[PDB]
Amino acid sequence: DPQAIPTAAAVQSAKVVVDRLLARQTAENNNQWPETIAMVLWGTDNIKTYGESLAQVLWLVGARPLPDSLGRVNKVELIPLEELGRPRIDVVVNCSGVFRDLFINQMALIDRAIKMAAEADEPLELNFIRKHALQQASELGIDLRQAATRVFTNASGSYAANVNLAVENSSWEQESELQDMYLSRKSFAFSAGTMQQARELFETALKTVDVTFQNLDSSEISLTDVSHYFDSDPTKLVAALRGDGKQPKAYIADTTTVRTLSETVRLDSRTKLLNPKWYEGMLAHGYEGVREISKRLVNTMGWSATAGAVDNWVYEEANATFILDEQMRQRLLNTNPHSFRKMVSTFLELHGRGYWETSEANLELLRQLYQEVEDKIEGVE
């Protein structure tokens, strides 16, 4: 029931997460407030939380919902700056296609809130939406309301950046290509039927991003269980667009019960890809199990592609665990030659793309093993 969202419980849960996100960012970077946060809104998650990440967006821009009598959220108002107790933070609101499919009315609500923030008569140092929208209105020669466009998604009918697909298929040379794919697919703006492409305004707003942010429940679907999270990650994109080339700080709120993306990748890697409990658990399935391990390594590479969030030691440990250990290598090779070949390919690709630095010895062995499994695959075929 899309008008039910967000509930007073979701509003209250969301305040805690946003205060924690801003506290970490200020404490780390010279007590500087971030100007703009790029964040993803997943539709399934907004069902389950009665609109927690929705409410996080409203909190950031200093808006509160207004349930009528039938518990419908039809309107917003601004929190006054003395109540907010900090600047209005600008937000690039990257809605999933599914969020768009289910919550067009709530995409309209966010939009009203941000335009409201933009038009407010308040000092620019306490209203980063207003500060940006005026600069943006001036640069591009448009209205302030037009300039205060922040609610973006896929084209009507479409899903995903297809950065996941690029990584899974190894069908790309430079990061610019992944970044071009994202900007070409995610630049469709909500406005008062049709998502209008607005690429130049999407790029302009993206260049103002200081922080990237997503909510995830690592207990249910971790950062590396699926490709959809790195698919939606604009961390390296923002660096590549910005005049100053500054990569924004990246965070993940884990809703299991706020970390840097780096911290979250390290936790997931030691819990899943590098953890004996996990990979032995997968190999118990046999043929499918080796596929799951290969998939994990590909999704980890995805985070290298979008964020450079994977420490070299993660790839060195994965190589030591699955390739250098002759016993484990033989089990992979014997159970699933096809997924073993993919894993060997993925280790060589990671070196090829500069995401993994390793010894000549390790690479020679990977090439040697690449030859041997192909020779075996063609053996039966």
Measured from the CB atom, the residue of 96 and 264 that comes closer to K ion is: 96
* Using rule CB under 5 A, residue 278 touches K ion: no
Shortest distance, position 97 Cβ to K ion, whole Å: 4
Q: Among the candidate windows 27-35, 71-79, 93-101, 233-241, which touches K ion by CB under 5 A? A: 93-101
Element (H, E) at 188: strand 188-189
What strands lie across the sheet with 249-254, from one edge to the other? Answer: 196-197, 188-189, 151-153, 90-95, 36-41, 209-216, 249-254, 259-260
d(CA 124, CA 95): 27
Measured from the CB atom, the residue of 159 and 370 that comes closer to K ion is: 159
Measured from the CB atom, the residue of 21 and 95 that comes closer to K ion is: 95
Q: Among the candidate windows 77-85, 95-103, 245-253, 304-312, which touches K ion by CB under 5 A? A: 95-103
Footprint on residues 142-181 left by K ion (CB under 5 A): 159-160
* Using rule CB under 5 A, residue 96 touches K ion: yes
Shortest distance, position 154 Cβ to K ion, whole Å: 6
Quick note: the x/- pattern for K ion over 41-80, rule CB under 5 A, is ----------------------------------------
Shortest distance, position 71 Cβ to K ion, whole Å: 28
The answer to whether 54 and 99 have CB atoms below 8 angstroms apart is no
Shortest distance, position 5 Cβ to K ion, whole Å: 19
Measured from the CB atom, the residue of 97 and 308 that comes closer to K ion is: 97
Shortest distance, position 156 Cβ to K ion, whole Å: 13
The residues pairing with 253 across neighbouring beta strands, listed in sequence order, are 215
- Helix 337-352 to helix 312-319 angle (10° resolution) is 150
d(CA 66, CA 11): 11
Shortest distance, position 230 Cβ to K ion, whole Å: 13
Q: Among the candidate windows 91-99, 108-116, 130-138, 247-255, which touches K ion by CB under 5 A? A: 91-99
- The answer for residues whose C-beta is within 8 angstroms of residue 129's C-beta and 6 or more apart is 61, 88, 90, 91, 114, 117, 118, 148, 150
Measured from the CB atom, the residue of 96 and 127 that comes closer to K ion is: 96
d(CA 76, CA 110): 8
Two tokens at 366?
A: 């990977």
SS3 helix, strand, coil % of the chain, rounded to 5? Answer: 60, 15, 30
Measured from the CB atom, the residue of 6 and 97 that comes closer to K ion is: 97
Shortest distance, position 202 Cβ to K ion, whole Å: 15
The answer to whether 240 and 175 have CB atoms below 8 angstroms apart is yes
Shortest distance, position 296 Cβ to K ion, whole Å: 22
Two tokens at 355?
A: 């995401």
How far does Cα 301 stand from its chain's mean position? Answer: 14
Shortest distance, position 105 Cβ to K ion, whole Å: 19
Encoded amino acid at 67, one letter: P
Q: Among the candidate windows 51-59, 94-102, 320-328, 342-350, which touches K ion by CB under 5 A? A: 94-102
Measured from the CB atom, the residue of 189 and 318 that comes closer to K ion is: 189
- The answer for residues whose C-beta is within 8 angstroms of residue 257's C-beta and 6 or more apart is none
The residues pairing with 188 across neighbouring beta strands, listed in sequence order, are 153, 197
Measured from the CB atom, the residue of 25 and 306 that comes closer to K ion is: 306
Measured from the CB atom, the residue of 159 and 172 that comes closer to K ion is: 159
Measured from the CB atom, the residue of 228 and 342 that comes closer to K ion is: 228
How many residues touch K ion under the rule CB under 5 A: the total is 4
Dihedral pair phi/psi, residue 29, rounded to 5°: -115, 65
State which of residues 43, 51, 62, 97 lies at the interface with K ion (CB under 5 A): 97
Q: Residues 375, 315, 40, 201: is their CA dihedral positive or negative?
A: negative
Shortest distance, position 101 Cβ to K ion, whole Å: 10
Could you tell me how many residues make up the chain?
381
List residues near K ion by CB under 5 A: 96-97, 159-160
